[PDB]
Design the sequence.
């Protein structure tokens, strides 16, 4: 199986899944990080991308 890892662009922190990133950011769920990645929008004031 596969869980795509994500990087917070401005901080450099990398999380093993959308869900781990969402939890670290106090967000409702992985959908909120997915939205930031797909739309190039901010979450927590930062940009987000996949790294694998």
Sequence:
């Amino acid at each position: 199986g596969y869980s795509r890892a994500v990087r917070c662009v401005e901080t450099g922190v990398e999380y093993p899944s959308l869900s781990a990133a969402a939890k670290a950011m106090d967000l409702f769920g992985p959908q909120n990080i997915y939205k930031a990645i797909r739309l190039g929008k901010l979450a927590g004031g930062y940009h987000w991308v996949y790294v694998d």
About this structure: The chain has one domain: 6-50. The radius of gyration is 9 Å. Strands lie at 6-8, 14-15, 48-50. The longest strand covers residues 6-8.
